[PDB]
Amino acid sequence: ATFEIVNRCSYTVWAAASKGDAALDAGGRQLNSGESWTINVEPGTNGGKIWARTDCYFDDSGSGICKTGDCGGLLRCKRFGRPPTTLAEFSLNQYGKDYIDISNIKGFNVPMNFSPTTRGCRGVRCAADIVGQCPAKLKAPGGGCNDACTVFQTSEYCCTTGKCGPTEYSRFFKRLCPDAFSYVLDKPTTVTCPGSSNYRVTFCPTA
């Protein structure tokens, strides 16, 4: 499957793509404002994620650091990124269908639209100014808006036991972005697409 990743932000981002235990395609790449990078994701990929990283510095070997979404200091991500990270999430060719969503469970750093470029389903978007409106206690000093689990490490925010409910913090993310997961047990906003659909992830779709 192809995923065209487009940076419409006025700032550079370093896109990342991983399924947690491996990179998807090259795993990461710099996208200056306006640039597009198309990756190929193997059919059947389960639990894949794409996200933006901000304020990165990498040496000639591809090692360094980003202020949001850093994946073990690598330009080419092999693992998931450090919160806060707005997440485009997908599982492909799962009993014949693809499943996509956007999640704020690991916080928010950059607004995004995640849409199919082929027919059969709609896209999802979280493009509100979550960082600007972020509750004081969730503001990440390194940049972005942290989720409450990251900040407080409680069973209720992290849904450790699996019986958690919505919280004042999850409701903030949900109010700003109704179409993205705000906590682990949020009413699903996952979209079912035809198996083997193709997609486009756009950072700063509206601004």
UniProtKB/Swiss-Prot annotation:
It is found in: Cytoplasmic vesicle. InterPro entries: Osmotin/thaumatin-like_sf, Thaumatin, Thaumatin_CS. One of its GO terms (cellular component) is cytoplasmic vesicle. Disulfide bonds join C9-C204, C56-C66, C71-C77, C121-C193, C126-C177, C134-C145, C149-C158, C159-C164. Its main location: cytoplasm. The keyword Disulfide bond applies. Keywords: Cytoplasmic vesicle, Disulfide bond, Signal, Taste-modifying protein. It comes from the Eukaryota. Taste-modifying protein; intensely sweet-tasting. It is 100000 times sweeter than sucrose on a molar basis. Belongs to the thaumatin family. This is Thaumatin I. It comes from Thaumatococcus daniellii (Katemfe).
